[PDB]
Amino acid sequence: GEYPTVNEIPVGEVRLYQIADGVWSHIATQSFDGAVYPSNGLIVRDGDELLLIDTAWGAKNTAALLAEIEKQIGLPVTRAVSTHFHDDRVGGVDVLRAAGVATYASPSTRRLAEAEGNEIPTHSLEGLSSSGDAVRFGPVELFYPGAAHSTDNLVVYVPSANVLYGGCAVHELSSTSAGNVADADLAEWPTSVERIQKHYPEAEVVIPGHGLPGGLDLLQHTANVVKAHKN
Numbered sequence: 001g002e003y004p005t006v007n008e009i010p011v012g013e014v015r016l017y018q019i020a021d022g023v024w025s026h027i028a029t030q031s032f033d034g035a036v037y038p039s040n041g042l043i044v045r046d047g048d049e050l051l052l053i054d055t056a057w058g059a060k061n062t063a064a065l066l067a068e069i070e071k072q073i074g075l076p077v078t079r080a081v082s083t084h085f086h087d088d089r090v091g092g093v094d095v096l097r098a099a100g101v102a103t104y105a106s107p108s109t110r111r112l113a114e115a116e117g118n119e120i121p122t123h124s125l126e127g128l129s130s131s132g133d134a135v136r137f138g139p140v141e142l143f144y145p146g147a148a149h150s151t152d153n154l155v156v157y158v159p160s161a162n163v164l165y166g167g168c169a170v171h172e173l174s175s176t177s178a179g180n181v182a183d184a185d186l187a188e189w190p191t192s193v194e195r196i197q198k199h200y201p202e203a204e205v206v207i208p209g210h211g212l213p214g215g216l217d218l219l220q221h222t223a224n225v226v227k228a229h230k231n
């Protein structure tokens with residue numbers, strides 16, 4: 001019994017998984033174009049409050065996420081950051097905002113969500129527009145590694161726990177293919193992974209946007225699957 005997998009989660013429920021003291025991932029499943037996929041997000045203790053990273057991919061899933069957090073953890077989710085503009089990151093922002101959660105994303109993510117017709121986080125995160133940029137946000141550091149899975153993708157580091165949340169710029173070890181690359185920059189993705197590797201060499205856990213956490217090997221693995229895809 002370990003990390004919850006796609007066939008173990010019916011669409012509509014949410015699981016929480018303890019990563020480190022004060023750090024959990026959240027896992028839910030959603031259908032898209034006629035197939036079912038898991039996806040991850042993060043929850044980080046922020047004093048006596050919680051910071052949420054990414055929705056649970058859908059309105060119902062995200063309402064279930066809030067209910068699961070309340071049951072299991074019982075501290076208020078005050079703020080959320082979405083790490084890029086796709087529905088597995090922002091779908092559910094309307095639920096969060098109606099629940100009083102202040103929602104944030106980079107201006108790039110906000111513009112791309114608006115243009116695509118996805119739900120739009122409220123507040124812009126400045127200081128992240130150039131590759132290599134980093135800012136603090138509560139108990140995490142936000143890092144813009146460059147264009148990869150999407151042009152706006154952000155990664156999240158929890159310094160107290162050495163947890164690197166790569167989001168969809170990072171793939172799980174069991175992958176051989178590169179996921180949904182419709183909005184990817186395949187020319188820049190390897191360079192962006194190299195920036196992550198250089199910036200977070202002490203990460204002890206690496207969490208992908210979809211699938212199982214592991215160690216630092218997920219970074220080079222991601223560069224390899226991107227190469228396999230390109231060719």
Ligand SMILES: C[C@H](c1ccc[nH]c1=O)c1cccc2c(-c3ccc(CS(C)(=O)=O)c(F)c3)c(C(=O)O)[nH]c12
Pocket residue numbers: 032037086087088149168171172174175176177178179180181182183209210211
């Ligand atoms: C919502 C989002 C999306 C919407 C619109 C444009 N673009 C998008 O991405 C989306 C919808 C449906 C599927 C995905 C996968 C994905 C697919 C396959 C695998 C297994 S694998 C690594 O073995 O290929 C995976 F891990 C993730 C990913 C990802 O790659 O982030 N995003 C997905």
Ligand SMILES: [Zn+2]
Pocket residue numbers: 084086149150168
């Ligand atoms: Zn995506």
Ligand SMILES: [Zn+2]
Pocket residue numbers: 086088168209210
């Ligand atoms: Zn994704």
